[PDB]
Design a protein around this ligand. Structure first.
Ligand SMILES: Nc1ncnc2c1ncn2[C@@H]1O[C@H](COP(=O)(O)OP(=O)(O)OP(=O)(O)O)[C@@H](O)[C@H]1O
Ligand SMILES: Nc1ncnc2c1ncn2[C@@H]1O[C@H](COP(=O)(O)OP(=O)(O)OP(=O)(O)O)[C@@H](O)[C@H]1O
Ligand SMILES: [Mg+2]
Ligand SMILES: [Mg+2]
Lengths: 267, 90, 237
DNA sequence: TTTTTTTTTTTT
């Protein structure tokens, strides 16, 4: 009675007590600019993999940038994988979102905001085109070992994966990402494009392009919705279909302030 | 027969080389559009391999990209002349 | 844009390094409108290259010269020399290809033309004609990815004209109607799309929508009218 | 044996 079959609570009781003691530490950093996400996702917890998807040109990158900027203010060290937008335009968008005002109008205040934003724990990767899973993941481990980052975002898996036996390399890379997340306790965010819909159906959790493993092994399936008008549709809606921790599903409308390029509070 | 332009690598030289090639016999002298400097700096910078490969791999002056209304002028004028022949038998 | 005031308040101009896709009903005037846009852009600074994979280079040149002349040039051949000479100095180029060609040979000509003429606007007509030759729905994605990589590594505005799938002739063309995989819709920066109001006799009243806009996201439509005499798409009326 | 993507027929 000494092999790898772990014994009962006689040695696991202490871990359970420790987890139950810090109930406010299991659910980690909360959101400041997003009161709705504080009552749905119950916060941001390390070691979980989440997938993001939405209609074409619906603002997936902009919303993720806002969430990352909100989380990076207090404690979270973030790493950005910009596989679609070059690192300068993304930097402009994030800076404009932080400044809460059109920085192009006033270049005299550029120095102050740049200095105040310079010390935040923000990191980027210079990868822009198609890359294999071996080279990108090595930089992830190297950045974890040095800067101690706890929130990595990859932009458009379909872009990086796109190069055979398709519908299988995607499963391999997403499994590698899940293994890296669980072995290191870093919140990995993935933006996976959906399959071709008919533009009049609400995007369900089964619309993820590829095998079903993406929805199976993910912990949060935050998905955007579009109400296609003829002129400036707006009124984007966000749904949370799956939630492993404290399962809760809900939606809430969002409005877009054009001046600040930020997703305002629900109205 | 096959000349190779070796103008300067800076500005106001590559365009001058293009202009000279256009003035001279087109589709007969290939220009050089490499990232290295002139042959003297290339020899100074130990770019002999570059000076032997890039020069030998010079971009041809012409290509299978038909020109603007310097050619095709006759065909357009003809098609605009016998407009009754564009639409055939009634 | 100069002849298109509406496009100055929707796409906010023409920016290098972006790939745009054009689509519309069959025989609705996709080639004519693209010709007008390219002609208006090439006037000031833009050096353009044309892919005439459906229309031979003579008819396309005739249409472009008619649009530039703003009148029926066939009526007055005495004025042909003046407008031909004025049209000669414009930085315009074409490719001699007319039939089916693989992506490896067409792309090399683009690079060769970029290295010489410093072009920043290459237009490809009828991607379905170029792709038409296996594993279909995969070569199209490959060539679209190659075009996107070429555009981002060279910073030249690549315009693509892709046919839509077989519609019912009574439904507005959505952004999901692009024939092939959905890679074109996600991967393109502008999804300029034409609309048709099918009448029984000379319908007209073509409508243009902008479903996607990566830079300064704006969506809007504006009707267009066609001056038959000058073969030009006039200002909205 | 999954997994998109276009196209014709039948029957909820
Ligand atoms: N709700 C909204 N209302 C108006 N404009 C918006 C809204 N959301 C985003 N935009 C605009 O759309 C532009 C593109 O945004 P973004 O880059 O996030 O799209 P994307 O999700 O990356 O597109 P794709 O899905 O094709 O990659 C932004 O410049 C932004 O100004
Ligand atoms: N709004 C319009 N009203 C009347 N005639 C038009 C209009 N637009 C285009 N045309 C005519 O239709 C003819 C064909 O135009 P064009 O070559 O652009 O079609 P196309 O888009 O190439 O067709 P396809 O989609 O089958 O390739 C032109 O000669 C033009 O005179
Ligand atoms: Mg994006
Ligand atoms: Mg056509």
């Amino acid at each position: 009675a000494a092999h790898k079959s772990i014994v009962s609570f006689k040695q696991l009781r202490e871990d359970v007590y420790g987890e139950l003691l810090n109930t406010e530490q299991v659910a980690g950093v909360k959101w400041t600019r997003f009161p709705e996400l504080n009552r749905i996702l119950k916060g941001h917890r390390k070691g979980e993999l989440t997938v993001f998807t939405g209609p074409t040109g619906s603002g997936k990158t902009t919303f993720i940038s806002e969430v990352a900027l909100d989380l990076c203010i207090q404690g979270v060290n973030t790493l950005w994988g910009s596989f679609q937008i070059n690192n300068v335009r993304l930097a402009k968008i994030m800076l404009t979102q932080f400044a809460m005002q059109r920085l192009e109008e006033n270049l005299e205040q550029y120095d102050f905001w740049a200095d105040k934003f310079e010390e935040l724990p923000l990191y980027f990767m210079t990868f822009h085109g198609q890359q294999n899973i071996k080279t990108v993941l090595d930089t992830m481990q190297h950045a974890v070992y040095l800067y101690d980052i706890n929130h990595v975002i990859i932009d458009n898996l379909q872009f990086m994966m796109g190069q055979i036996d398709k519908y299988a390399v995607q499963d391999h890379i997403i499994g590698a990402f899940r293994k890296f997340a669980t072995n290191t306790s870093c919140h990995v965010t993935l933006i996976i494009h959906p399959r071709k819909e008919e533009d009049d159906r609400e995007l369900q959790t089964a619309s993820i392009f590829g095998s079903a493993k993406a929805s199976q092994e993910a912990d949060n399936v935050l998905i955007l919705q579009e109400k296609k008008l003829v002129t400036c549709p707006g009124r984007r809606s966000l749904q949370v279909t799956k939630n492993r921790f404290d399962g809760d599903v809900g939606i809430f409308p969002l409005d877009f302030i054009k001046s600040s390029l930020t997703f305002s509070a629900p109205i | 027969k096959r000349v190779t332009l070796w103008l300067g690598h800076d500005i106001r030289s590559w365009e001058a080389s293009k202009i000279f090639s256009r003035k001279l016999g087109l589709r007969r002298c290939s220009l050089v559009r490499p990232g290295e400097d002139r042959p003297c700096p290339l020899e100074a910078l130990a770019r002999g391999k570059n000076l032997s490969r890039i020069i030998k791999t010079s971009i041809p002056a012409a290509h299978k990209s038909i020109v603007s209304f310097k050619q095709l002028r006759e065909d357009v004028y003809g098609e605009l002349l016998n407009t009754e022949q564009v639409a055939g038998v009634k």
